[PDB]
Structure 1
């Protein structure tokens, strides 16, 4: 965590990693293993990979200085999914659902 707004961000992160959302969050838990998934163009198309384990390490290391920096990494993770995948792939449906969880709770940021 860190500041009051970063504690709200840390709360969101814990929720995104929780059993509550595991049915659609699991593709975002760890970095995409492009080689393992046969996605040999992944790193040509996605210049800045991002995933929830990386967000968690950056939060634990007090890398994020504000909520905006945290949100930019979470949205980068979703954007990468929308950029690489055809819009009818199950992983895109899962990204949309997890981003809905993220955006509605991020909007409840304490001022």
Structure 2
């Protein structure tokens, strides 16, 4: 229970104004109808995003912090898999993942 409270706090920080300039691509599910994304679901078998993670915390779907962390890392991994490594969204992902990993390590 205490683990999951910390997970909620980590996600709240990831949604916070101070990180918004690089966190915003991850707020909502990737829009697969947008121009250029017609192949997203062919490449990414398990989409994930911060609003879906929030809804799962609110439904108590995660039984512990490790399950929550797996979905956060899935979100970042999907970004690293789909996009070219030099893409601006990958640099944003690395920054937000640093925010996450330092908090998740220290809970």
TM-fit CA distance, 1:37: 3.7
Structure 1: 4+ residue segments shifted above 6 A: none
TM-score between the two structures when normalised by the length of structure 1:
0.94
Which stretch has the larger CA shift, 4-13 or 36-45? 36-45
Corresponding residue number in structure 2 for 1:46: 44
Corresponding residue number in structure 1 for 2:19: 21
| 1:1-111 superposed matches below 5 A | 3-109=1-107
SS in 2 for 1:99: helix
Q: Distance in 2 between matches of 1:54 and 1:37?
A: 23
SS in 2 for 1:34: coil
TM-fit CA distance, 1:38: 2.4
CA-to-aligned-CA distance 1:25-80 (integer Å, 9 cap, x gap): 00000000021142111000000000000000000111110000000000000000
Unaligned residue ranges in structure 2 (runs of 5+): none
TM-score between the two structures when normalised by the length of structure 2:
0.98
